[PDB]
Design a protein around this ligand. Structure first.
Ligand SMILES: CN(Cc1ccc(F)cc1)C(=O)CC(=O)C(=O)O
Ligand SMILES: [Mn+2]
Ligand SMILES: [Mn+2]
Ligand SMILES: [Mn+2]
Length: 225
């Protein structure tokens, strides 16, 4: 259960990240979590781009979208959508010099590795940046660029609820979203998913997980793909 004050302050108090006199105030690494679409009913693809300000977090980008055809063409669509958001966030924040991405590979491990590669090729065509992916060892023990969700989801949700209520999770006032803002405010949209958090959710799961993978404890899992 999320406090009404935290919801109110999340809406009215946002980080002004474009003052050139304040570029050296923020963390220089962008953490991205991607939750791909999974179908009786179909879920969408959730993407969140978070960063650090001291011991707090700020959301830079959010993407939530549903596909019309889910046969390999969707992999290109998911990757391009995520890459477009990342490129725009990096264009506005020149202080970001590292990119740490986690692609959820629970639904399909092979498709997750394909998406990771597609994002890496798009981002590297557009900008010169260090790109690291979360690596998990597969059935054959070879490290692959995907994240596997399990029991730790309970820990990540718990951690989030405590940080959110303390006001340690804030939005950027130059928050990038190409998929949302379609008769919405991206924050008001995210807040609706926050109010339904229990003990569609793809966007809040991406926010919870991106802020969870910020920890030093996970740093060793991020490698060049
Ligand atoms: C079923 N899984 C994979 C999963 C498996 C085990 C686990 F602990 C956590 C996640 C989904 O990711 C579903 C989803 O996004 C959705 O319905 O929007
Ligand atoms: Mn408002
Ligand atoms: Mn998922
Ligand atoms: Mn999902």
């Amino acid at each position: 259960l999320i406090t009404d004050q935290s919801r109110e302050e999340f809406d009215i108090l946002r980080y002004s990240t474009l003052n050139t006199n304040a570029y050296d105030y923020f963390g220089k690494t962008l953490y991205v979590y991607l939750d791909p679409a999974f179908t009786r009913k179909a879920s969408g693809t959730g993407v969140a781009a978070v960063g650090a300000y001291r011991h707090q977090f700020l959301i830079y980008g959010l993407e939530h979208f549903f596909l019309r055809d889910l046969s390999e063409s969707s992999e290109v669509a998911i990757a391009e959508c995520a890459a477009h958001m990342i490129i725009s966030v990096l264009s506005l924040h020149p202080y970001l010099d590292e990119l740490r991405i986690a692609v959820e590979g629970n639904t399909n491990q092979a498709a997750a590795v394909r998406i990771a590669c597609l994002i890496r090729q798009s981002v590297q065509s557009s900008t010169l940046i260090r790109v690291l992916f979360y690596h998990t060892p597969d059935q054959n023990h070879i490290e692959q660029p995907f994240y596997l969700m399990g029991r730790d989801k309970a820990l990540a949700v718990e951690q989030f609820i405590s940080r959110f209520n303390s006001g340690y999770i804030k939005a950027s006032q130059e928050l990038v979203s190409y998929t949302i803002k379609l008769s919405h405010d991206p924050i008001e949209y995210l807040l609706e998913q926050i109010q339904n958090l229990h003990r569609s959710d793809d966007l809040i799961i991406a926010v919870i997980m991106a802020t969870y993978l910020c920890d030093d404890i996970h740093a060793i899992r991020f490698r060049v793909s």
